[PDB]
């Protein structure tokens, strides 16, 4: 039932909606969600492509913007920034109620900037200023250039959603860059208490990549095992004396965020990823259909840290089979960037 979202909050996990549209906000639906336990919103270029194509409230906005001398990209940004700013206003009461720990809305930079650290910094600073809300997160892919940009953006006081993570190694590199940016600010006497960063670790795409060729006892298990091991890495990193010295001065931990948590294989229960990854100080961003399946028949239990030993044994067997999860992660990040660029090109074409 609907109270499950509150039960999950009590276990220490926020549930965000992985969708955004002009009608979602304008209808009042998002506000009602932010009363019934939803704690934030994520977007990406595929989400906007589908919203712009299907939501009737964009038609008049597009017609208005076509009367102006703007590039397709700027037409897109005007639309997307307006949606994000409106959603941020809806979520602001939630965000302020927790001291800025919840109630975020994420907007992703252009996929073409993913390997360009300086360009990513420039666009993220610009979008942060354009949205002009304290609860907006700029979403940046976790390429090496994105991790470069993360350190700079954090040192500038900007909250970031580092996305398209599939690798435990790259996640640890992100934590290190975050800490460097925090340390820089503390050394300069600047505030850090309202800087929040999430590390969005993608789930379903790992199983989609591997399951057809895995042995029976491993089908549908690798992505959850990776996430459970990532969370153990997180506990270790953030409790170590190095980070404790920063947290003592007001620094916030990065939080792991499970994304791509819609189940894509009909052989698995539709609530598998949500049900299996609940742990303290995490987020799960879910598509609409998965949110309503979880409300209908999900289970709120602290599953993320259960049976870590079996997660380790499974990952050892994946390696024994010759699957290198670091090579896979790079490929999945590459593929995800290509797919986001394809969606972005598809949404720009009607805006010409």
Swiss-Prot record:
Subcellular location, record wording: Cytoplasm
PROSITE patterns the UniProt entry points to: TRANSALDOLASE_1, TRANSALDOLASE_2
Reaction equation(s) it catalyzes: D-sedoheptulose 7-phosphate + D-glyceraldehyde 3-phosphate = D-erythrose 4-phosphate + beta-D-fructose 6-phosphate
One Pfam short name: TAL_FSA
Keywords of this entry: Cytoplasm, Pentose shunt, Schiff base, Transferase
This enzyme's EC code(s): 2.2.1.2
Keyword Transferase: yes
Gene Ontology terms: cellular component: cytoplasm
Entry GO MF terms: transaldolase activity
Active-site feature positions: 139 (schiff-base intermediate with substrate)
Pathway connected to this protein: Carbohydrate degradation; pentose phosphate pathway; D-glyceraldehyde 3-phosphate and beta-D-fructose 6-phosphate from D-ribose 5-phosphate and D-xylulose 5-phosphate (non-oxidative stage): step 2/3
The keyword Lipoprotein belongs to this UniProt entry's keyword annotation: no
Swiss-Prot/TrEMBL GO biological process terms: carbohydrate metabolic process; pentose-phosphate shunt
PANTHER family xref list: TRANSALDOLASE
Similarity field: Belongs to the transaldolase family. Type 2 subfamily.
Annotated function: Transaldolase is important for the balance of metabolites in the pentose-phosphate pathway.
Protein name, per record: Transaldolase
Biological source species: Neisseria gonorrhoeae (strain ATCC 700825 / FA 1090)
Upper classification of the organism: Bacteria, Pseudomonadati, Pseudomonadota, Betaproteobacteria, Neisseriales
Gene that this sequence comes from: tal
């Amino acid at each position: 039932g609907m109270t499950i979202l509150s039960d999950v909050k009590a276990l220490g996990q926020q549930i965000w909606l992985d969708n955004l549209s002009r009608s979602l906000v304008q209808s009042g639906e998002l506000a009602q969600m932010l009363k019934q336990g939803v704690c934030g919103v994520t977007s990406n270029p595929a989400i906007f492509q589908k919203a712009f194509a299907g939501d009737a409230l964009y038609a008049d906005e597009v017609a208005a913007l076509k009367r102006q001398n703007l590039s397709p990209k700027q037409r897109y940004e005007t639309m997307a920034v307006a949606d994000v700013r409106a959603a941020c206003d809806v979520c602001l009461a939630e965000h302020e109620s927790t001291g800025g720990k919840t109630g975020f809305v994420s907007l992703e930079v252009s996929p073409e900037l993913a390997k360009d650290a300086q360009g990513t910094v420039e666009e993220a600073r610009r979008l942060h200023a354009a949205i002009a809300r304290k609860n907006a997160m700029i979403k940046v892919p976790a390429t090496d250039a994105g991790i470069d940009a993360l350190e700079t953006l954090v040192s500038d006081g900007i909250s970031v959603n580092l996305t398209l993570l599939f690798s435990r190694a790259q996640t640890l590199k992100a934590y290190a860059a975050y800490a460097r940016g925090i340390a820089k600010r503390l050394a300069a006497g600047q505030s850090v208490a309202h800087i929040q960063v999430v590390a969005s670790f993608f789930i379903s795409r790992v199983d989609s990549a591997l399951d057809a060729t895995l042995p029976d006892r491993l089908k549908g298990k690798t992505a959850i095992a990776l996430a459970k091991a990532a969370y153990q890495d997180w506990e270790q990193y953030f409790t170590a004396p190095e980070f404790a010295a920063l947290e003592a001065q007001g620094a916030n931990r990065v939080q792991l965020l499970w994304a791509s948590t819609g189940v894509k294989n009909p052989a698995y229960p539709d609530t598998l990823y949500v049900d299996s990854l609940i742990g303290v100080h995490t987020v799960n961003t879910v598509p609409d259909a998965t949110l309503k399946a979880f409300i209908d028949h999900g289970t709120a239990k602290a599953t993320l840290t259960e049976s870590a030993d079996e997660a380790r044994a499974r990952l050892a067997e994946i390696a024994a089979l010759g699957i290198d999860v670091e090579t896979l992660a790079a490929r999945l990040q590459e593929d995800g960037l290509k797919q986001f660029e394809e969606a972005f090109e598809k949404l720009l074409a009607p805006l010409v």
